[PDB]
Amino acid sequence: SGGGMTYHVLVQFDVPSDKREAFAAAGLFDANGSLQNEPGTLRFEVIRDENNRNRFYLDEVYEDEAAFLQHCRNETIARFYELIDSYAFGPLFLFKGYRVEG
Amino acid sequence: GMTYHVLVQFDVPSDKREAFAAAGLFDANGSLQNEPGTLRFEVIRDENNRNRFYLDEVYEDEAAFLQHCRNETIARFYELIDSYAFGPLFLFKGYRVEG
Amino acid sequence: GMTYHVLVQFDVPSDKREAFAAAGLFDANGSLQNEPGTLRFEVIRDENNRNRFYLDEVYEDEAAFLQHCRNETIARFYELIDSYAFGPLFLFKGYRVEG
Amino acid sequence: MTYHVLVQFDVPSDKREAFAAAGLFDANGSLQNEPGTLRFEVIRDENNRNRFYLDEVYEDEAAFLQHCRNETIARFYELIDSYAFGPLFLFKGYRVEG
Amino acid sequence: GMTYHVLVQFDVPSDKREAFAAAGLFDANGSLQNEPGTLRFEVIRDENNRNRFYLDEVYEDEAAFLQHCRNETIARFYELIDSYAFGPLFLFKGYRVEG
Amino acid sequence: GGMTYHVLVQFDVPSDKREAFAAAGLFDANGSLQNEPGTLRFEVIRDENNRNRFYLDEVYEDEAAFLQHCRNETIARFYELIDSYAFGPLFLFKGYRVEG
């Protein structure tokens, strides 16, 4: 109710087989640090592919595009990329878009 | 919890943008009203591609998605869009990581 | 046996599903009958997307695929579908691993 | 009208031979022991040396699900679990009869 | 690194192949003549898919790309193609590796 | 010949091989441009955000010039350099430039 046209960002990552737990922790660090400290970050979910064990998705929702750009500039995402720099493939942006309200 | 996430992609002709958005919202609202296992259903338009839409669906488990698949709302949704829409293309199906 | 496998993807309008199926079957049967290097040719429809079709082609070697590409059967195939079909999108080309 | 499943895998450069053997194990074990499994081919990309494809044919969709809960595919995933990227399903579908 | 490269993909109906080429050419020429930060803009047709086009664009930096996105040429390009073209789909954005 | 042949290629590399691939891609670019008359342009591009992903933007006189490139020694050495780590090539497209 009353959410407006929120900004949806879907990200895809692949990681080596021995980094599945490491990336899950890094993704949750990103989700929790972002949701705790960035008001414009409304939702941040880490999703594991049902069959592809090395593939992960981030389903992120922001108040608007400006809030996503602010997130991209903040400390949490910088630390996230420090954590995964040694192994992770990505980010591949599956899409960015606006919610159709109704 | 460890919910089941399904992301779908649809492409429509340029004169069917309003028609598909209404159909997708019908799908979202009808599913949330009639299906206890359907927890979240959002229609998303690509930020630049005006002919591409996404469905972001969340279910209790996979069984609830399969129930959605055999229910009345999705069948009516496809009767509405079959003549013009291109899809579904499943971008992924997956489970949420708890934490 | 290190045969050459080519996988191709096509998208068609909703009212052209039967016409593309017929054109794809012509391509398969014409190529298998008239091209000694063409060993297998199947038309596959997507289980969920009623507008998406795949061609699964097997050749003696890569040279036999390039010959197919220069032959008359595929030319007639593209003549049939040119006004409506979207493609080809090659999903892969590769060699069978023997064993 | 047979049921066709196309799967895609990526593997590290030093695991190409390991995956090919695992895919062939999957193919031969499935064809020998699963009456619903009709065809199973392992394909290497012509240029992408780390990318492989599985081209599988079943008598129907139920036979594919039966394959999916049998022993051979479980041993296949045991062989590749420590390195393989995938499965990515390129498509599942039915052959057009004719 | 150096220059900022943007690769875009469009799909059009079979009867709009000439229209889109003219539109992409209008976009390319209008942007190169008029935008100093727009260094290269190429329209490319797929070698086999007659309905798929690619735009290969190079800018001085990302700001020059965002400026291009705000100019009148791209706005007119999208007015020309809005009724039929499918896109844009961004294949990638990146920086040239120097050397 | 009024239509050049454009080939777009995509690679992924392990995180510790980014500099190695950049050097390998530049060897390929400079070796091809210096020794292949049919090779008109060859650029190595890194993804703006995907740090393990690279692209090759290649332009040839015609399709025959691309196939000749594929048979020459520069690309063979390129694949020797990257054999032990690189994922790819994935061809994003091959196509012809529109004139006007």
How far is residue D34's CA from residue D28's CA, in Å, rounded to a whole number? 10
Q: Is E77 exposed, middle or buried (0-12, 13-18, 19+ CB in 10 A)?
A: buried
Q: How many residues does chain C have?
A: 99
Alpha-carbon Rg of chain E, whole angstroms?
13
Residue B87 to residues B78, C92, D16, Cα–Cα distance (Å): 10, 22, 34
**Angle at the Cα of B9 from the Cα atoms of A25 and A80, rounded to 5 degrees:** 20
Cα A88 to chain centroid distance, Å, stands at 14
- Residue of F14, F16, F50 lying closest to A92 (CB–CB): F50
How far is residue D32's CA from residue D35's CA, in Å, rounded to a whole number? 8
Structure token digits, residue C94: 């590769």
How far is residue E64's CA from residue C47's CA, in Å, rounded to a whole number? 44
SS3 B25: helix
State the count of interchain CB pairs (< 8 A) between A and F: 19
Contact B28, A101 (CB under 8 A): no
How far is residue F41's CA from residue F38's CA, in Å, rounded to a whole number? 9
- The architecture that CATH gives domain D3-86 is 2-Layer Sandwich (3.30)
What is the end-to-end Cα distance of chain A in Å, rounded? 9
- Structure determination technique employed: X-ray
How far is residue A41's CA from residue D71's CA, in Å, rounded to a whole number? 45
For F76, list phi and psi in degrees, rounded to 5. Answer: -65, -40
Q: How far is E68 from chain B (nearest CA, A)?
A: 15
- Sign of the torsion angle spanned by Cα atoms D65, D93, C26, C77: negative
SS3 E7: strand
Query: For residue C97, what is the DSSP state?
Result: P
How far is residue B11's CA from residue B85's CA, in Å, rounded to a whole number? 6
- Do the bridges between strand E52-59 and strand E4-11 make them parallel or antiparallel, or are there none, so unpaired? antiparallel
Residues 6+ apart with CB under 8 A from A14: A54, A55, A56, A88, A89, A90, D85
Contact E3, E95 (CB under 8 A): yes
Residues 6+ apart with CB under 8 A from F44: E96, E97, E99, F22, F25, F26, F28, F29, F54, F55, F56
How far is residue F56's CA from residue F33's CA, in Å, rounded to a whole number? 13
Cα E19 to chain centroid distance, Å, stands at 15
HEC assignment per residue over chain D: CCEEEEEEEECCHHHHHHHHHHHHHHHHHHHHHCCCEEEEEEEEECCCCCEEEEEEEECCHHHHHHHHCCHHHHHHHHHHCCCCEEEEEEEEEEECCC
For A84, list phi and psi in degrees, rounded to 5. Answer: -100, 0
Q: Please list the residues that pair with A85 across neighbouring strands.
A: none
How far is residue C13's CA from residue C19's CA, in Å, rounded to a whole number? 10
Verify whether the Cβ–Cβ distance C99 to D44 is below 8 Å.
no
How far is residue D20's CA from residue D42's CA, in Å, rounded to a whole number? 7
SS3 F65: helix
Q: Please list the residues that pair with A99 across neighbouring strands.
A: B44
Following CA atoms D67, D58, D87, A92 in sequence, which dihedral angle do they give, to the nearest 10 degrees? -150
Q: Nearest-CA neighbor of C64 among C2, C1, C4?
A: C4
- Residue of D83, D88, D89 lying closest to A17 (CB–CB): D83
- The architecture that CATH gives domain C4-95 is 2-Layer Sandwich (3.30)
Verify whether the Cβ–Cβ distance D43 to C95 is below 8 Å.
yes
Q: Nearest-CA neighbor of C6 among F88, D6, F66, D49?
A: D6
Q: How many CB atoms lie within 10 A of CB B79?
A: 10
Contact E32, F83 (CB under 8 A): no
- H/E run at residue E81: helix E72-81
Following CA atoms A64, A69, A75, A76 in sequence, which dihedral angle do they give, to the nearest 10 degrees? 50
For D86, list phi and psi in degrees, rounded to 5. Answer: 135, 180
Following CA atoms F57, F60, F63, F68 in sequence, which dihedral angle do they give, to the nearest 10 degrees? -100
Please identify which residue in the block is written with the tokens 């692949």: A14
Structure token digits, residue D50: 């780390």
Q: How many CB atoms lie within 10 A of CB D59?
A: 16
**Angle at the Cα of D5 from the Cα atoms of B91 and D68, rounded to 5 degrees:** 95
Contact E64, E35 (CB under 8 A): yes
How far is residue C51's CA from residue E99's CA, in Å, rounded to a whole number? 46
Contact D36, D42 (CB under 8 A): no
For F21, list phi and psi in degrees, rounded to 5. Answer: -70, -40
Preceding omega of F89 cis (within 30 degrees of 0): yes
Q: Is C70 exposed, middle or buried (0-12, 13-18, 19+ CB in 10 A)?
A: exposed
Structure token digits, residue F39: 């090779």
For A9, list phi and psi in degrees, rounded to 5. Answer: -125, 120
Verify whether the Cβ–Cβ distance C87 to E49 is below 8 Å.
yes
Q: How far is D26 from chain C (nearest CA, A)?
A: 11
Please identify which residue in the block is written with the tokens 């080596």: A16
SS3 B44: strand
Alpha-carbon Rg of chain A, whole angstroms?
14
Query: For residue C20, what is the DSSP state?
Result: H
SS3 B61: coil
Fold of F5-90: Alpha-Beta Plaits (3.30.70)
Query: A69: phi > 0 → left, psi -120 to 50 → alpha, else beta; which?
Result: alpha
Residue of chain D whose alpha carbon sits nearest to that of F76: D47
Residues of A with a Cβ under 8 Å from any B Cβ are 7-8, 10, 12, 24-25, 27-28, 31-32, 45-50, 55-57, 59, 65, 94-100, 102
SS3 C96: strand
Q: How many CB atoms lie within 10 A of CB E55?
A: 21
- The architecture that CATH gives domain A7-98 is 2-Layer Sandwich (3.30)
- H/E run at residue F78: helix F73-82
Residues 6+ apart with CB under 8 A from A12: A55, A56, A57, A58, A90, A91, A92, A93, A94, B92
Query: For residue E37, what is the DSSP state?
Result: T
Q: Please list the residues that pair with D57 across neighbouring strands.
A: D4, D39
Cα D14 to chain centroid distance, Å, stands at 20
Domain boundaries, chain D: 3-86
Residues 6+ apart with CB under 8 A from A91: A11, A12, A13, A58, F49, F50
One-letter identity of residue E30: G
Structure token digits, residue E85: 């073209």
Verify whether the Cβ–Cβ distance D95 to C42 is below 8 Å.
yes
Structure token digits, residue B83: 């003549």
For C50, list phi and psi in degrees, rounded to 5. Answer: -70, -5
**Residues preceding gaps in chain C (C to N > 2.5 Å):** none
Residue D26 to residues D8, D69, D78, Cα–Cα distance (Å): 14, 13, 11
Q: How many CB atoms lie within 10 A of CB D28?
A: 13
How far is residue A17's CA from residue C50's CA, in Å, rounded to a whole number? 35
Verify whether the Cβ–Cβ distance E82 to B49 is below 8 Å.
no
Please identify which residue in the block is written with the tokens 């090919």: D20
Verify whether the Cβ–Cβ distance B47 to A96 is below 8 Å.
yes
Structure token digits, residue A84: 């995964």
Contact D49, D9 (CB under 8 A): no
Cα D19 to chain centroid distance, Å, stands at 11
